[PDB]
């Protein structure tokens, strides 16, 4: 197949990664393995490293005239290319082979492991109120040259490139995502029962969502409305819990349920960009450089809950609201996911 | 899972037409509707595409302005309107379909219509 | 820009199981995103080959492709008495897409 490259301003530093694109099973996530292509009489004193740094950078990289990221580090790691290491982890691997019997000798292999307690790739979508990119937390490969790991950054030397973390959908369907709600008075005997239930737990995007929701309207008030929407909720931890939520879309029926009275109906509703360009707050999957995606994929929680909290968490959620007739509004909510199926 | 589609027939060049092509068996959003016309006996070329997902329209170089592109998400079917009909714009139409995540080439293709300008 | 394709031959002929290679050039570098496209006589085309390696569902397996830097290979293994047609190729990768201009395949005598 292919490989990409990018090379340094210099043109004697050129790195080859093996993908772009990097996925997880819930319990290994493929290895970051690479090779750096160096002539040595250009650096003569000095060592070769390569650094996968993840931050939680904000606005753009583009040399614009605003405040710009609150770079807090989330994980960073080191590793000394050349001059040669021990053998591990462990071994040159197929790719780095096959790398070196392609190049030669001025190859050097680097590895890496991405711990499973990370983030996946998420990028907030920029306000048009505000100028630049956005937010998001993201990953970078960046290898450098210098005597010392503290030396001074050069342009010349350090090769920047973007990768991306995302997430696949297990093939095991989850339990079927239902839920119902019985509403009293204050006093009188009559109640309100209401019932929703889901297709399914898992859906692809712009694929519709067909809501099964059922209303048993035997009391005296009078349902005016019924409000169906998706709502998304960001868990955002940087040091404290910050949960940003946001609709992304609603459909609405003039359907009255008359008291003593049942109602079932069900409603096409999909998650889509195209109609919410504008609102800020936004998640999208994470970008390579400013190319336009879907909603940000949902993502899955390993079995073992421990904490996995260093970063963006996206989730979403399906409320239907019933407007009942001077006061007594009752909603149901219900949890789902919505992200991509396994390529091959 | 099909492809149909209607609106075949003679136009007075300077006149105008509208063709549809109704989807059934997919999903609109996550699938995307493009259109490529074949002349005869020449070799078939892209003209123009919707993106419903993202809210995108584009044209070809030679055609930008003159046609336009419309999409109803509600009966699953697509609109586009032909103006200012040329001569040389005569030739066979078909309606395509295409997984929008990713781009993977164009699985599926309609029955076809052709288009015939002349006095 | 405009990314025109460059095919050759326009037309060959050849018989009941035989090798027949048609190449794709580009002007300009494309990754991956390149297929090919066959198109009976007065009938709707149908994919053949997507990401310019991947054979397509309900396809007969003696299709095959391959790629060499702009030069685009598609072979066929045994020719079955019924391929007899037109074969497009095309470049997607950015806006808008190019098609080929029909390679003929017909039987020898």
């Known amino acids: 197949t292919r490989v990409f490259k990018k090379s340094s301003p210099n043109g004697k530093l050129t790195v080859y990664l093996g993908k772009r694109d990097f996925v997880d099973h819930l319990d290994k996530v493929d290895p970051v393995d690479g090779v750096v292509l160096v002539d040595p009489d250009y650096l003569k004193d000095r060592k070769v490293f390569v650094t996968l740094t993840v931050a939680f950078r904000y606005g753009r990289e583009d040399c614009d005239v605003l405040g710009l990221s609150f770079r807090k580090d989330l994980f960073i790691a080191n590793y000394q290319a050349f001059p040669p290491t021990p053998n591990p982890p462990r071994p040159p691997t197929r790719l780095q082979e096959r790398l070196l019997r392609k190049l030669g000798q001025h190859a050097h292999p680097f590895f890496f492991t991405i711990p499973q307690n990370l983030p996946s790739s998420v990028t907030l979508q920029p306000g048009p109120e505000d100028t630049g990119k956005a937010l998001g937390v993201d990953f970078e490969i960046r290898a450098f040259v210098a005597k010392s790991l503290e030396e001074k950054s050069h342009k010349r030397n350090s090769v920047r490139l973007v990768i991306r973390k995302v997430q696949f959908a297990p093939e095991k369907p989850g339990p079927q995502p239902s839920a119902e709600t019985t509403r009293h008075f204050l006093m009188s005997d009559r109640s309100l029962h209401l019932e929703a239930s889901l297709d399914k737990e898992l859906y692809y995007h712009g694929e519709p969502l067909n809501v099964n929701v059922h209303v048993t309207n035997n009391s005296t008030k009078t349902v005016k409305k019924i409000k169906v929407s998706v709502r998304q909720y960001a868990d955002i931890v940087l040091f404290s819990t910050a949960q940003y939520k946001v609709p992304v879309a609603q459909v609405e029926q003039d359907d009255q349920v008359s008291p003593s009275s049942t109602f079932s109906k069900v409603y096409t509703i999909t998650p889509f960009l195209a109609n919410n360009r504008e609102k800020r707050g936004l998640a999208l999957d994470g970008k390579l450089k400013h190319e336009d995606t879907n909603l940000a994929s949902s993502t899955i929680v390993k079995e073992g809950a421990n904490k996995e909290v260093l970063g963006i968490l996206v989730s979403y959620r399906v409320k239907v609201k019933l407007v009942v007739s001077r006061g007594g509004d009752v909603s149901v909510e219900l949890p789902f996911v919505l992200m991509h199926p396994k390529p091959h | 899972v099909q492809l149909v589609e209607s609106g075949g027939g003679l136009v007075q060049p300077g006149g105008s037409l509208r063709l549809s092509c109704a989807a059934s068996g997919f999903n609109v959003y996550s699938s995307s509707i493009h259109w490529v016309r074949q002349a005869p006996g020449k070799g078939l070329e892209w003209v123009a595409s919707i993106s419903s997902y993202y809210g995108y329209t584009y044209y070809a170089d030679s055609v930008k302005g003159r046609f336009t592109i419309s999409a109803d998400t509600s009966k699953n079917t697509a609109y586009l309107q032909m103006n200012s009909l040329r001569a040389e714009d005569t030739a066979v139409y078909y309606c395509?379909?295409?997984?929008?995540?990713?781009?993977?080439?164009?699985?599926?293709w309609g029955q076809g219509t052709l288009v015939t300008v002349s006095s | 820009s405009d990314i025109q394709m460059t095919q050759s031959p326009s037309s060959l002929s050849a018989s009941v199981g035989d090798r027949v290679t048609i190449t794709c050039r580009a002007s300009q570098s494309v990754s991956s995103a390149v297929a090919w496209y066959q198109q009976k006589p007065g009938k709707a085309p149908k994919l053949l080959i997507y990401s310019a390696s991947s054979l397509y569902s309900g396809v007969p397996s003696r299709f095959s492709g391959s790629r060499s830097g702009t030069d685009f290979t598609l072979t066929i293994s045994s020719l079955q008495p019924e391929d007899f047609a037109t074969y497009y190729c095309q470049q997607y990768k950015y806006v808008p897409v190019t098609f080929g201009q029909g390679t003929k395949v017909e039987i020898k005598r």
């Open positions: 395509a379909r295409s997984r929008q995540f990713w781009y993977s080439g164009l699985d599926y």
